[PDB]
Amino acid sequence: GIFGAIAGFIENGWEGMVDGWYGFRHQNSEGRGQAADLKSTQAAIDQINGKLNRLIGKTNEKFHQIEKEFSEVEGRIQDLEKYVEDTKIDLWSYNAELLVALENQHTIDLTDSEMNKLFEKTKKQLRENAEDMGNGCFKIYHKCDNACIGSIRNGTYDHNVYRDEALNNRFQI
């Protein structure tokens, strides 16, 4: 994808994450765990549902048209009726195939985008208290129990509480 997160610096997806599309796995003094991020999941789902709202259940009514099958050879007028229909079908077939290829490229990029946005947001929350290990994981340089992890996932982590502890551990030797 164009951001380089999904199938990129995130090595692989998590089959064990079943309650969301994006989320957090942690390891701390109390154990290891997983939690889905609801806002990024919903942002991706909402955009894809916008595409589906454009495409599903939106057909046009047509009634009497031209004939499209013929039992007898006729020449000029029948040649034209067939050419008109073949022309129309080829143009709609082109539209359909291009639409799906374009939309699919965009869907892969927007889902990569949402993964990147969540990563960047988390990175900024941690300020000087953590370092990016390069694979979607942060090494957090302070004791960070379950409530602490939860404060990061919830966007209420106060980096100033832990900064002295974290700087001491980071800039050791």
Partner 1 sequence: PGATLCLGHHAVPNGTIVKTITNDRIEVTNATELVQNSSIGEICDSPHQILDGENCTLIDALLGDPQCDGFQNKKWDLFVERSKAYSNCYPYDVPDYASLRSLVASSGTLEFNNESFNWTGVTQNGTSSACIRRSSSSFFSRLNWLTHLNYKYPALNVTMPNNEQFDKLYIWGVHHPGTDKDQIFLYAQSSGRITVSTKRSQQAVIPNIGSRPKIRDIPSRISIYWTIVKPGDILLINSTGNLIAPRGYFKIRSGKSSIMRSDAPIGKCKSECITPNGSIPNDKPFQNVNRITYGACPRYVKHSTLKLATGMRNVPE
Window 2-61: residues binding a second copy (CB under 8 A): 2-4, 8-9, 54, 60
Beta carbons within 8 Å of 140's beta carbon, 6+ residues apart: 126, 129, 130, 166
If binding is defined by CB under 8 A, does position 74 make contact with partner 1?
yes
If binding is defined by CB under 8 A, does position 79 make contact with a second copy?
yes
Q: Which of residues 80-99 bind partner 1 (CB under 8 A)?
A: 85, 89-90, 92-93, 96-97
Biggest CA–CA distance in the chain, Å, is 93
With CB cut-offs between 5 and 8 Å by kind, which of a second copy, partner 1, none does residue 10 bind? partner 1
Closest CA to 37 of 105, 125, 117: 117
Tokens of 45: 């789902």
Q: Which of residues 138-167 bind partner 1 (CB under 8 A)?
A: 138-144, 148-149, 152
∠76-79-85 over CA atoms, to 5°? 145
Residues making up the chain, counted from first to last: 173
Residue 31 Cβ, how far from a second copy at the closest point, in Å?
Answer: 26
∠12-112-131 over CA atoms, to 5°? 70
d(CA 5, CA 137): 12
Of the residues 52, 84, 100, 161, which one makes contact with a second copy according to CB under 8 A: 84
If binding is defined by CB under 8 A, does position 168 make contact with partner 1?
no
How many residues bind a second copy (CB under 8 A)? The answer is 52
Q: Which of residues 110-139 bind partner 1 (CB under 8 A)?
A: 110-112, 115, 118-119, 122, 130, 133, 135-139
